[PDB]
């Protein structure tokens, strides 16, 4: 917007962290699954 362009200097680092941690966890689980296919 014009004088109300506050969103330009903002970033949702909170969501990014939530998503990043979700991904890291799921990649960790996936890895266990493939490894445990025989121990």
């Amino acid at each position: 917007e014009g004088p109300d362009n506050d969103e330009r200097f903002t970033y949702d680092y909170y969501r990014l962290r939530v998503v990043g941690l979700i991904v890291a966890a799921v990649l960790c689980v996936i890895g266990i699954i493939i490894l445990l296919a025989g121990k």
């Binding site: 962290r17 890291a24 960790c28 490894l35 296919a37």
Partner: protein, 992 residues
């Protein structure tokens, strides 16, 4: 020091009984005086063995703390505390950087110390096992009276008494004996009881009957003797000292480790000081000049590599534990793969160590029995009525019996009370005719004449199990020729017939052939006594010939030997196909040694000794060109008068070598001879007479079930199931781990470049620091760890058992070709991918690449809270630093992303991934966990403080992707060239 002990012993068995007493101030009848014995005790010292001085574990741990990488990491750790000290004095720095980094680095050294300490293990209790062979007490005659004393109180000169069941307390001169037999397997590896008597019977004291040795035991009878040697001075006490004293030495794998440590340490100190001066010239304060150096150290040293090696070794040892192959020393996991020569004991190693029936001669025909443990062969005969007649004599004319409670274990494995030949016959009949006890119940023995030294035969009279007869049957066995002189008829295919010169000659032929096979041959015959001349109550006199022992019916011959283990012939061939030379080294007699050599394939068909040529051509041995003989058989008595140079010529000039009737020191000498030629040597054995050789071997392998305690103490590896096929597996595993270590090392080293280059450009370019010191440790200690380990699970790219053993002088674990690829090619591509993401982060935040050159001065200036970017905006100190640390984080993640491809390319040295596939589940695990770790380290809240890791935007992850792919393609194209032309260019330049 031990050169004296490598020599054959000198003795006094040639002296008379009386003469021997003068030498030791002793009485043959009364024995020593209580006072004289105590005097000699203080004089000579105790009848005991002293363990050699060991190196304390303290010094062993700390010796690792100073080996190249640890030295550089120490210089870094201290240089951290240096910069910290210089700070705490000058400008009060409330930070924790240099202090904490100095603590972290010192911990890395200590923990890395534990890994190398675990790898360099030496579990040795040789002298302890020997000490276990000296009895607690001994029986001596002192002041004309026998008393038990502490065996350590035994001295040279006193009168000792032994009987069946006790250990020889010391080396004795036999002066009196009654039916005494002894087990000399300690000195020979052969357990057949040897008679002991006062009479001298051989110039060689290790063969004479009037000497009994410490480390052996009396098996039966009784004997008295004069002590000639005590403690360390006994024949086997010296073997003990020799074995326990031998310098261990560095393994092939250990030598390789130190070698690349020098290389990497070299480049480290080079670039280290090369850029330390390069910085001072650029006008960098010593305050900074050291900070850069610390970074250089951390970049160049692969912090997690030595521990990777240890883990890869451990994991390989775990797989072998699962095939009944125990590894006592982690490094011995690889030595077997580098082995070019095997020196093998015969008895209990190549052989089962059990007299077993091998052949039978009946119906004018040679039949072969199955000698294998698990009976993997086939039948020979069952139909012939002759067989049942021979079978009956083998069962009936036999005094051997199975020990109680064996019905669970297989026939051939069960313990038997009796001599070896009777046990063999027992197990033979029990196997192919069922319960022998049954045959001995159906035919009650009424009278017998046990085998006599003079008779040279054993006879028995039984009540024929037949109801229509129920009469008296005579059976006998003995020396083949003696049995022949007592026969008139031969049981041919059922019916008897006169013994014509024809069949008599066929007997001699059969007899000579079986004997030529190194087999012990016995004759078997029977005689159905006439009914009218022998009533159902007729008494037979065993003392005086009350019955005919002539004109009997010859039934057949039986031959026997201590046979090879089932897997041995095939394992020997497999070792030989892998280009490993196999030598036999045995305490056993030459005829037996040679026969098993041919049986297992040590001596291949057609190959001759000089003696064979001479007999065939009917010419003198001196007339034979010795170069025409590729095979040789050396008796220990001849070995004794040969110099090592002459032993070296024997080793060089023959492909098929048999060393027979060797002493324990002689086995050591042969091993050393092989090593002297530059060969990596394995020893396989099971007896205490293998202990020195096992110790000196680059790798000693002991048998687990049949092995003596001493042998297993002297070894690096134990075959817990006595499965000789495990040697073949071991060499295969050894070669595989050697290749996989290269892959894992290249992988680990490759990521050094993207950690070095940022620090260099930081100096030469004056840009903001692309990657931090902490960030490097997150790679080498964190992300790269599981992937690097996973390479240990790689399958072979080709048939490794088809290639020759590596040349330890030329074929190195880390060579110039590895460095060229890891440092010069792949690592360089990784460095760029790192920098790219760095420029991306900065440029998208407003600092375009052009304006970055020569800005670090203002960038690092803590007091400038208004640096202008390319777009004209102003940044505080902490604001721009957040972007900088975000650059460290994405550079870090870029390494991880480019290591994805590197992990896949390091999978194979030659083959394509499209050929080798992706069947390594540990490797795939590594990829997932590596990425999980990196993501966690970036996105987990609080990690921005502890590690300076900042959250990355999704687009950031993909910066290095095009570089990751170029790596995959590049290496795939390169290896395509290797395969397409075995010529050499790409091969001799980059082929690890």
């Amino acid at each position: 020091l031990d050169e004296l002990k490598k020599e054959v012993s000198m003795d006094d068995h040639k002296l008379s009984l009386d003469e021997l007493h003068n030498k030791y101030g002793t009485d043959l009848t009364r024995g020593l005086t209580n006072a004289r014995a105590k005097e000699i005790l203080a004089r000579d010292g105790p009848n005991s063995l002293t363990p050699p001085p060991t190196t304390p574990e303290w010094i062993k741990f700390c010796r690792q703390l100073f080996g190249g990488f640890s030295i550089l990491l120490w210089i870094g750790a201290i240089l951290c505390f240096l910069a910290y000290g210089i700070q705490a004095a000058t400008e009060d720095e409330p930070a924790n950087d240099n202090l904490y980094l100095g603590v972290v680095l010192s911990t890395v050294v200590i923990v890395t110390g534990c890994f190398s300490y675990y790898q360099e293990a030496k579990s040795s209790r040789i002298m302890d096992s020997f000490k276990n062979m000296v009895p607690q007490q001994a029986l001596v005659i002192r002041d004309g009276e026998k008393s038990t004393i502490n065996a350590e109180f035994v001295v040279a000169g006193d009168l000792v008494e032994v009987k069946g069941g006790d250990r020889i307390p010391a080396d004795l001169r036999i002066i009196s004996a009654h039916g005494c037999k002894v087990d000399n397997s300690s000195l020979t590896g052969e357990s057949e009881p040897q008679t002991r008597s006062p009479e001298f019977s051989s110039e060689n004291p290790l063969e004479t009957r009037n000497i009994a040795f410490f480390s052996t035991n009396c098996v039966e009878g009784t004997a008295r003797g004069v002590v000639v040697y005590t403690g360390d001075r006994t024949v086997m006490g010296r073997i003990a000292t020799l074995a326990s004293g031998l310098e261990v030495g560095r393994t092939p794998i250990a030598i390789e480790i130190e070698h690349f440590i020098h290389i990497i340490t070299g480049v480290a100190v080079f670039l280290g000081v090369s850029f330390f001066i390069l910085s001072l010239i650029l006008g960098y304060s010593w305050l900074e000049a050291v900070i850069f150096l610390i970074g250089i150290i951390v970049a160049n040293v692969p912090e997690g590599l030595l521990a990777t090696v240890t883990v890869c070794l451990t994991l390989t040892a775990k797989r072998m534990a699962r095939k009944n192959c125990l590894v006592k020393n982690l490094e011995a996991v690889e030595t077997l793969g580098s082995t070019s020569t095997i020196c093998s004991d015969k008895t209990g190693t190549l052989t089962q160590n059990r007299m077993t029936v091998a052949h039978m001669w009946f119906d004018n025909q040679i039949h072969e029995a199955d000698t294998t443990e698990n009976q993997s062969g086939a039948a020979f005969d069952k139909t012939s009525a002759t067989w049942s007649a021979l079978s009956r004599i083998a069962a009936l004319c036999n005094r051997a019996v199975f020990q109680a409670g064996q019905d669970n274990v297989p026939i051939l494995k069960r313990s038997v009370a009796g001599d070896a030949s009777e046990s063999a016959l027992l197990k033979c009949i029990e196997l192919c005719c069922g319960s022998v006890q049954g045959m001995r119940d159906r035919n009650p023995k009424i009278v017998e004449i046990p085998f006599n030294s003079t008779n040279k035969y054993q006879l028995s009279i039984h009540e024929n199990e037949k109801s229509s007869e129920s009469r008296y049957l005579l059976v006998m066995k003995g020396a083949p020729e003696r049995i022949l002189d007592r026969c008139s008829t031969i049981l041919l295919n059922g019916a008897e017939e006169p013994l014509k010169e024809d069949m008599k000659e066929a007997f001699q032929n059969a007899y000579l052939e079986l004997g030529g096979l190194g087999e012990r041959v016995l004759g078997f015959c029977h005689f159905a006594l006439p009914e009218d001349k022998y009533n159902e109550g007729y008494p037979f006199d065993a003392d005086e010939p009350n019955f005919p022992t002539t004109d009997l019916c010859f039934v057949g011959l039986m031959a026997m030997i201590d046979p090879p283990r089932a897997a041995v012939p095939d394992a020997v061939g497999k070792c030989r196909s892998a280009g490993i030379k196999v030598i036999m080294v045995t305490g056993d007699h030459p005829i037996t040694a040679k026969a098993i050599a041919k049986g297992v394939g040590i001596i291949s068909e057609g190959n001759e000794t000089i003696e064979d040529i001479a007999a065939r051509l009917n010419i003198p041995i001196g007339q034979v060109n010795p170069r025409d003989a590729k095979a040789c058989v050396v008796h220990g008595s001849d070995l004794k008068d040969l110099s090592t140079e002459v032993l070296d010529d024997i080793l060089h000039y023959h492909t098929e070598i048999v060393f027979a009737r060797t002493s324990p020191q002689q086995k050591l000498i042969i091993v050393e001879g092989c090593q002297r030629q530059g060969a990596i040597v394995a020893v396989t054995g099971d007896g205490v007479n293998d202990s020195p050789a096992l110790k000196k071997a680059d790798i000693g392998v002991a048998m687990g079930i049949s092995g003596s305690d001493v042998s297993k103490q002297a070894a690096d590896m134990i075959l817990l199931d006595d499965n000789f096929a495990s040697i073949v597996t071991g060499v295969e595993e050894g070669r595989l781990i050697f290749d996989n270590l290269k892959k894992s090392i290249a992988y680990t080293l490759t990521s050094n470049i993207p950690e070095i280059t940022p620090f260099l450009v930081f100096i030469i370019g004056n840009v903001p620091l692309p990657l931090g010191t902490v960030t490097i440790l997150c790679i080498d200690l964190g992300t790269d760890m599981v992937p690097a380990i996973s390479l240990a699970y790689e399958q072979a790219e080709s048939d490794i058992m088809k290639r020759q053993p590596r040349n330890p002088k030329t074929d190195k674990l880390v060579n110039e070709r590895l460095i060229s690829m890891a440092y010069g090619q792949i690592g360089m591509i990784q460095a760029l991918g790192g920098f790219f993401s760095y420029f991306v982060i900065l440029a998208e935040n407003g600092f375009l690449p052009m304006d970055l050159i020569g800005k670090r001065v203002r960038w690092d200036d803590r007091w400038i809270s208004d640096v202008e970017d390319s777009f004209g905006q102003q940044w505080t100190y902490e604001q721009r630093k957040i972007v900088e640390f975000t650059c460290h984080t994405s550079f870090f993640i870029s390494i991880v992303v480019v290591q994805w491809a590197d992990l896949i390319i390091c999978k194979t040295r030659r083959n394509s991934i499209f050929q080798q596939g992706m069947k390594n589940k540990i490797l795939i695990f590594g990829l997932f966990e590596e990425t999980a770790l990196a993501a966690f380290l970036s996105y987990c809240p609080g990690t921005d403080v502890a590690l300076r890791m900042y959250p990355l935007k999704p687009s950031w992850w993909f910066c290095a992707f095009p570089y990751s792919l170029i790596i995959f393609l590049y290496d795939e194209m390169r290896r395509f060239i290797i395969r397409r032309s075995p010529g050499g260019w790409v091969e001799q330049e980059t082929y690890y």
